[PDB]
């Protein structure tokens with residue numbers, strides 16, 4: 385079955401503009417705010433939450449918090465998902481997502497630079513760097529918008545289990561599934577749309593996780609979103625053709641988005657949405673970074689040229705999907 389939205393290839397001019405990176409400076413300033421331990425229940429976690437909210441409210445986005453208390457192996461804990469929507473009334477959302485909590489590591493202070501400080505900064509960076517074009521797109525009345533979700537409580541408090549993980553994403557998926565709505569209440573839904581609740585408005589969720597290490601390897605995890613995944617492959621290829629990727633030597637190419645699918649199961653914030661038929665693109669590397677869940681998942685183990693390259697792909701992707 386065809387993707388419900390016709391995916392119009394980015395014009396060369398727009399590819400080149402989106403592939404240009406002061407841009408490094410703004411991104412790094414944003415990232416600095418996330419490179420702090422931010423365990424659920426902590427003051428720094430609160431400060432990170434508030435920084436996300438303020439940053440997006442300053443860009444004139446609608447920002448909502450889904451706050452609740454949940455039982456954990458460490459007792460009751462407070463959680464707050466942050467949901468920012470460019471145009472609340474638009475029927476359909478391109479959803480980009482990540483988690484903003486950091487793992488409570490028993491061995492010491494854990495920064496979670498890839499997991500997921502970088503993805504958090506990347507979402508804010510997209511909103512900031514594309515603001516002018518996004519605000520223009522919002523005026524079109526075309527029924528499509530951008531939505532950013534920063535999930536809380538992705539990490540387990542003890543041993544990962546169905547009950548001890550994904551606290552924020554499980555909560556939000558249930559909340560949205562139970563919140564009934566219909567096309568007549570929303571702006572410009574696609575003709576063939578079946579809208580019965582808020583989750584139906586998530587046209588695709590692109591979940592970023594464990595980004596920032598050198599040479600990530602992505603694969604298509606879901607046949608349902610192959611048409612969308614293939615746009616990432618294509619965009620990356622075109623950025624390389626144009627010489628816009630940062631490589632250690634001339635005449636190398638990035639090959640992050642493999643033109644293949646993998647049979648691998650990864651549990652993450654997409655799971656509660658996947659179970660409710662939300663199409664998922666899971667932008668998570670396989671293998672995971674070497675530093676995964678170690679005290680070495682820190683700022684210095686990030687690979688800045690890779691981050692810049694990913695930012696180009698992501699900007700071009702959002703530009704292509706929203707026709708910015």
Ligand SMILES: COc1ccc(NC(=S)NCCCn2ccnc2)cc1OC
Nearest residue numbers: 499593594649650651652670671672676
């Ligand atoms: C070390 O390499 C792996 C370890 C575990 C798994 N399997 C699962 S189900 N992981 C769930 C990860 C949830 N998460 C996301 C961010 N922080 C935690 C796969 C891995 O390599 C493909």
Ligand SMILES: [Zn+2]
Nearest residue numbers: 487499539677
């Ligand atoms: Zn983790």
